[PDB]
Short mmCIF file of all heavy atoms in Angstrom, two decimals:
data_model
loop_
_atom_site.label_atom_id
_atom_site.label_comp_id
_atom_site.label_asym_id
_atom_site.label_seq_id
_atom_site.Cartn_x
_atom_site.Cartn_y
_atom_site.Cartn_z
N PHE A 1 75.91 47.26 177.57
CA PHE A 1 75.03 46.19 177.93
C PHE A 1 74.03 45.82 176.86
O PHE A 1 73.45 46.73 176.25
CB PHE A 1 74.25 46.54 179.23
CG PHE A 1 75.09 46.51 180.47
CD1 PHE A 1 75.52 47.72 181.02
CD2 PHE A 1 75.45 45.31 181.08
CE1 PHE A 1 76.27 47.73 182.21
CE2 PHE A 1 76.27 45.33 182.23
CZ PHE A 1 76.63 46.51 182.81
N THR A 2 73.82 44.53 176.67
CA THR A 2 72.69 44.00 175.87
C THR A 2 71.41 44.12 176.64
O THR A 2 71.38 44.02 177.89
CB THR A 2 72.94 42.55 175.47
OG1 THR A 2 74.18 42.44 174.79
CG2 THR A 2 71.85 42.02 174.61
N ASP A 3 70.28 44.38 175.95
CA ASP A 3 69.02 44.43 176.59
C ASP A 3 68.65 43.04 177.15
O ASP A 3 69.04 42.02 176.50
CB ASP A 3 67.93 44.96 175.69
CG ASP A 3 68.08 46.42 175.42
OD1 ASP A 3 68.55 47.11 176.36
OD2 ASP A 3 67.72 46.88 174.33
N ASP A 4 67.91 42.98 178.25
CA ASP A 4 67.62 41.76 178.85
C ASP A 4 66.81 40.84 177.93
O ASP A 4 66.91 39.59 177.97
CB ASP A 4 66.80 41.91 180.15
CG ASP A 4 67.66 42.51 181.28
OD1 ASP A 4 68.88 42.49 181.17
OD2 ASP A 4 67.05 43.06 182.21
N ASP A 5 66.00 41.40 177.03
CA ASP A 5 65.18 40.58 176.18
C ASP A 5 65.94 40.19 174.94
O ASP A 5 65.36 39.53 174.04
CB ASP A 5 63.87 41.24 175.81
CG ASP A 5 64.09 42.53 175.05
OD1 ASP A 5 65.20 42.88 174.58
OD2 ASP A 5 63.08 43.26 174.89
N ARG A 6 67.19 40.59 174.85
CA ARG A 6 68.08 40.27 173.73
C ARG A 6 67.53 40.68 172.36
O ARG A 6 67.79 40.00 171.37
CB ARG A 6 68.36 38.75 173.71
CG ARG A 6 68.90 38.24 175.05
CD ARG A 6 69.20 36.78 174.91
NE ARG A 6 70.65 36.60 174.75
CZ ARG A 6 71.49 36.30 175.69
NH1 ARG A 6 71.06 36.00 176.94
NH2 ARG A 6 72.79 36.15 175.43
N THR A 7 66.84 41.81 172.34
CA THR A 7 66.34 42.37 171.07
C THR A 7 67.10 43.57 170.62
O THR A 7 66.76 44.20 169.59
CB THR A 7 64.87 42.86 171.26
OG1 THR A 7 64.85 43.86 172.29
CG2 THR A 7 63.91 41.74 171.55
N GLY A 8 68.15 43.94 171.39
CA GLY A 8 68.94 45.11 171.15
C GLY A 8 69.88 45.43 172.27
O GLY A 8 70.18 44.60 173.13
N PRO A 9 70.38 46.69 172.29
CA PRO A 9 70.15 47.76 171.34
C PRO A 9 70.93 47.49 170.05
O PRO A 9 71.96 46.81 170.05
CB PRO A 9 70.72 48.94 172.10
CG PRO A 9 71.82 48.42 172.82
CD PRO A 9 71.40 47.04 173.31
N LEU A 10 70.46 48.12 168.96
CA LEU A 10 71.12 47.84 167.67
C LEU A 10 72.63 48.07 167.60
O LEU A 10 73.39 47.27 167.05
CB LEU A 10 70.42 48.71 166.57
CG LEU A 10 70.85 48.46 165.13
CD1 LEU A 10 70.66 46.99 164.73
CD2 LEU A 10 70.10 49.40 164.21
N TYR A 11 73.12 49.16 168.24
CA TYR A 11 74.56 49.45 168.33
C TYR A 11 75.33 48.24 168.75
O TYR A 11 76.23 47.80 168.06
CB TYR A 11 74.78 50.62 169.28
CG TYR A 11 76.17 51.18 169.48
CD1 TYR A 11 76.46 52.61 169.30
CD2 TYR A 11 77.23 50.46 170.00
CE1 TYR A 11 77.69 53.17 169.52
CE2 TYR A 11 78.46 50.98 170.18
CZ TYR A 11 78.71 52.31 169.98
OH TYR A 11 80.00 52.77 170.24
N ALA A 12 74.99 47.69 169.92
CA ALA A 12 75.71 46.51 170.45
C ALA A 12 75.60 45.32 169.49
O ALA A 12 76.54 44.64 169.18
CB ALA A 12 75.06 46.15 171.78
N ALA A 13 74.40 45.11 168.95
CA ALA A 13 74.15 44.04 168.02
C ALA A 13 75.03 44.09 166.79
O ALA A 13 75.57 43.08 166.38
CB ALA A 13 72.71 43.97 167.62
N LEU A 14 75.27 45.31 166.29
CA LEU A 14 76.04 45.35 165.05
C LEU A 14 77.48 45.47 165.32
O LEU A 14 78.35 44.98 164.56
CB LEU A 14 75.56 46.56 164.18
CG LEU A 14 74.12 46.40 163.70
CD1 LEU A 14 73.75 47.48 162.67
CD2 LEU A 14 73.92 45.07 163.17
N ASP A 15 77.83 46.02 166.51
CA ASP A 15 79.20 46.08 166.93
C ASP A 15 79.85 44.67 167.16
O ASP A 15 81.03 44.52 167.14
CB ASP A 15 79.30 46.86 168.25
CG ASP A 15 80.68 47.52 168.47
OD1 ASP A 15 81.36 47.76 167.39
OD2 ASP A 15 81.11 47.66 169.62
N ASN A 16 79.04 43.66 167.39
CA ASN A 16 79.58 42.39 167.64
C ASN A 16 80.33 41.79 166.49
O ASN A 16 81.21 40.93 166.64
CB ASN A 16 78.57 41.40 168.17
CG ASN A 16 78.23 41.57 169.62
OD1 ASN A 16 79.03 42.05 170.41
ND2 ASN A 16 76.97 41.35 169.94
N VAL A 17 80.00 42.26 165.29
CA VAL A 17 80.69 41.71 164.09
C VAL A 17 82.15 41.95 164.20
O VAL A 17 82.95 41.07 163.89
CB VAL A 17 80.15 42.30 162.80
CG1 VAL A 17 80.86 41.70 161.59
CG2 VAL A 17 78.68 42.04 162.67
N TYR A 18 82.55 43.13 164.68
CA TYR A 18 83.95 43.45 164.87
C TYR A 18 84.53 42.54 165.93
O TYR A 18 85.59 41.89 165.71
CB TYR A 18 84.14 44.93 165.20
CG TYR A 18 85.52 45.15 165.70
CD1 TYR A 18 86.61 45.23 164.83
CD2 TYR A 18 85.72 45.29 167.06
CE1 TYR A 18 87.90 45.42 165.32
CE2 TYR A 18 87.01 45.46 167.56
CZ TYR A 18 88.08 45.56 166.74
OH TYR A 18 89.35 45.79 167.21
N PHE A 19 83.85 42.51 167.08
CA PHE A 19 84.43 41.68 168.18
C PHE A 19 84.45 40.18 167.84
O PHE A 19 85.28 39.52 168.37
CB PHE A 19 83.64 41.96 169.47
CG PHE A 19 83.91 43.37 170.00
CD1 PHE A 19 82.88 44.28 170.11
CD2 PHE A 19 85.20 43.75 170.39
CE1 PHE A 19 83.11 45.58 170.57
CE2 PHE A 19 85.44 45.00 170.79
CZ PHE A 19 84.44 45.95 170.89
N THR A 20 83.62 39.74 166.95
CA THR A 20 83.64 38.31 166.50
C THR A 20 84.67 38.05 165.41
O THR A 20 85.18 36.91 165.31
CB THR A 20 82.22 37.93 165.92
OG1 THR A 20 81.25 37.90 166.99
CG2 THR A 20 82.22 36.58 165.35
N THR A 21 85.04 39.09 164.70
CA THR A 21 85.89 38.81 163.50
C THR A 21 87.35 39.15 163.65
O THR A 21 88.23 38.54 162.96
CB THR A 21 85.33 39.56 162.28
OG1 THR A 21 84.80 40.75 162.70
CG2 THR A 21 84.24 38.72 161.66
N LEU A 22 87.70 40.06 164.57
CA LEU A 22 89.08 40.52 164.57
C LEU A 22 89.88 40.10 165.80
O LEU A 22 90.88 39.43 165.64
CB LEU A 22 89.19 42.02 164.25
CG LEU A 22 89.06 42.22 162.74
CD1 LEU A 22 88.93 43.64 162.42
CD2 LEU A 22 90.29 41.61 162.03
N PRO A 23 89.48 40.48 167.03
CA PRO A 23 90.33 40.20 168.14
C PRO A 23 90.49 38.71 168.41
O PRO A 23 89.55 37.91 168.15
CB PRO A 23 89.63 40.89 169.33
CG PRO A 23 88.69 41.87 168.68
CD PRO A 23 88.22 41.20 167.46
N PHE A 24 91.59 38.29 169.03
CA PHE A 24 91.78 36.87 169.40
C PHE A 24 91.03 36.54 170.69
O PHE A 24 90.69 35.38 170.91
CB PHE A 24 93.19 36.54 169.63
CG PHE A 24 94.06 36.46 168.40
CD1 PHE A 24 94.38 37.63 167.69
CD2 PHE A 24 94.53 35.27 167.91
CE1 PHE A 24 95.21 37.56 166.52
CE2 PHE A 24 95.31 35.20 166.76
CZ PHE A 24 95.64 36.33 166.12
N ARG A 25 90.81 37.55 171.53
CA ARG A 25 90.18 37.35 172.86
C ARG A 25 88.69 37.60 172.69
O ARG A 25 88.30 38.59 172.17
CB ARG A 25 90.68 38.44 173.82
CG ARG A 25 91.38 37.82 175.03
CD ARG A 25 91.82 38.87 176.10
NE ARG A 25 92.70 38.19 177.13
CZ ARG A 25 92.24 37.43 178.10
NH1 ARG A 25 90.97 37.16 178.23
NH2 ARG A 25 93.12 36.81 178.92
N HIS A 26 87.78 36.66 173.16
CA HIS A 26 86.39 36.94 172.99
C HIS A 26 85.85 38.00 173.94
O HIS A 26 85.86 37.75 175.17
CB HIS A 26 85.53 35.67 173.12
CG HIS A 26 85.94 34.50 172.22
ND1 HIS A 26 87.11 33.81 172.37
CD2 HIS A 26 85.32 34.00 171.15
CE1 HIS A 26 87.18 32.87 171.46
NE2 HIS A 26 86.10 32.93 170.67
N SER A 27 85.52 39.18 173.48
CA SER A 27 84.67 40.14 174.27
C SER A 27 83.16 39.82 174.22
O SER A 27 82.60 39.58 173.18
CB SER A 27 84.92 41.56 173.75
OG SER A 27 86.27 41.96 173.86
N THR A 28 82.61 39.72 175.40
CA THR A 28 81.14 39.50 175.56
C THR A 28 80.44 40.70 176.11
O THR A 28 80.86 41.27 177.13
CB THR A 28 80.84 38.24 176.40
OG1 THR A 28 81.43 37.10 175.74
CG2 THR A 28 79.32 38.01 176.36
N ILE A 29 79.32 41.09 175.47
CA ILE A 29 78.46 42.11 176.05
C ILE A 29 77.35 41.39 176.77
O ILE A 29 76.39 40.80 176.16
CB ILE A 29 77.91 43.07 174.99
CG1 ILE A 29 79.09 43.81 174.31
CG2 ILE A 29 76.93 44.05 175.60
CD1 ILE A 29 78.76 44.32 172.87
N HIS A 30 77.41 41.32 178.11
CA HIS A 30 76.46 40.67 178.96
C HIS A 30 75.18 41.52 179.07
O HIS A 30 75.22 42.70 178.91
CB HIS A 30 77.04 40.45 180.32
CG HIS A 30 78.46 39.97 180.28
ND1 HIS A 30 78.82 38.61 180.15
CD2 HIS A 30 79.65 40.67 180.37
CE1 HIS A 30 80.14 38.54 180.18
NE2 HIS A 30 80.65 39.75 180.27
N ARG A 31 74.03 40.89 179.32
CA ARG A 31 72.80 41.66 179.55
C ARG A 31 72.94 42.33 180.92
O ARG A 31 73.74 41.93 181.72
CB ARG A 31 71.58 40.78 179.53
CG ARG A 31 71.42 39.98 178.28
CD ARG A 31 70.99 38.57 178.52
NE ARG A 31 69.73 38.57 179.21
CZ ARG A 31 69.45 37.91 180.33
NH1 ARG A 31 70.43 37.26 180.99
NH2 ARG A 31 68.24 38.01 180.87
N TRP A 32 72.13 43.35 181.12
CA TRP A 32 72.01 44.02 182.42
C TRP A 32 71.72 42.99 183.55
O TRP A 32 72.41 42.99 184.55
CB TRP A 32 70.88 45.06 182.39
CG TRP A 32 71.05 46.13 181.39
CD1 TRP A 32 70.61 46.07 180.12
CD2 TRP A 32 71.62 47.44 181.55
NE1 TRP A 32 70.89 47.23 179.44
CE2 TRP A 32 71.53 48.12 180.34
CE3 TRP A 32 72.25 48.06 182.61
CZ2 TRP A 32 72.00 49.36 180.15
CZ3 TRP A 32 72.76 49.35 182.43
CH2 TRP A 32 72.60 49.99 181.20
N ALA A 33 70.75 42.16 183.26
CA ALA A 33 70.29 41.17 184.19
C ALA A 33 71.38 40.17 184.57
O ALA A 33 71.54 39.78 185.75
CB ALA A 33 69.03 40.43 183.66
N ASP A 34 72.22 39.72 183.58
CA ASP A 34 73.36 38.89 183.88
C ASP A 34 74.29 39.50 184.92
O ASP A 34 74.69 38.82 185.88
CB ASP A 34 74.20 38.69 182.63
CG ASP A 34 73.55 37.74 181.66
OD1 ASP A 34 72.79 36.87 182.12
OD2 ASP A 34 73.71 37.97 180.42
N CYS A 35 74.53 40.73 184.75
CA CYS A 35 75.47 41.47 185.61
C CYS A 35 74.88 41.70 187.01
O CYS A 35 75.51 41.54 188.02
CB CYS A 35 75.87 42.78 184.97
SG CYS A 35 77.22 43.60 185.94
N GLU A 36 73.57 42.04 186.97
CA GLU A 36 72.87 42.24 188.21
C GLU A 36 72.94 40.97 189.06
O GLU A 36 73.20 40.99 190.23
CB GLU A 36 71.47 42.70 187.97
CG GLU A 36 71.37 44.16 187.69
CD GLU A 36 69.99 44.56 187.20
OE1 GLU A 36 69.25 43.66 186.76
OE2 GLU A 36 69.66 45.73 187.26
N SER A 37 72.74 39.81 188.37
CA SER A 37 72.82 38.50 189.04
C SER A 37 74.19 38.29 189.71
O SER A 37 74.21 37.81 190.84
CB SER A 37 72.53 37.39 188.06
OG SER A 37 72.72 36.16 188.71
N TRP A 38 75.28 38.55 189.00
CA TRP A 38 76.59 38.37 189.63
C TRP A 38 76.78 39.18 190.90
O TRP A 38 77.41 38.70 191.86
CB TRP A 38 77.70 38.74 188.58
CG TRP A 38 77.60 37.96 187.36
CD1 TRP A 38 77.04 36.69 187.21
CD2 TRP A 38 78.09 38.34 186.10
NE1 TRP A 38 77.12 36.31 185.90
CE2 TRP A 38 77.80 37.28 185.17
CE3 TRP A 38 78.73 39.48 185.62
CZ2 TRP A 38 78.12 37.35 183.86
CZ3 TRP A 38 79.10 39.53 184.28
CH2 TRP A 38 78.80 38.48 183.41
#
């Protein structure tokens, strides 16, 4: 999960480079609040 304030955590933030650059399917890390809403 991404933090609700979208300031981190750093792991998730830097891990997105892989998810943005390689797979054909877009993986999204939703915030906690997004998921709680659903």
Side-chain angles (χ1 to χ4, degrees):
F1 289 104
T2 302
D3 288 330
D4 291 342
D5 62 9
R6 306 183 101 100
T7 57
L10 186 55
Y11 185 124
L14 298 189
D15 206 27
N16 283 330
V17 180
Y18 165 77
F19 292 116
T20 291
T21 35
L22 282 169
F24 287 72
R25 240 185 192 281
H26 303 72
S27 300
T28 303
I29 298 154
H30 316 277
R31 304 138 61 235
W32 301 86
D34 287 331
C35 188
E36 278 170 341
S37 176
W38 301 336

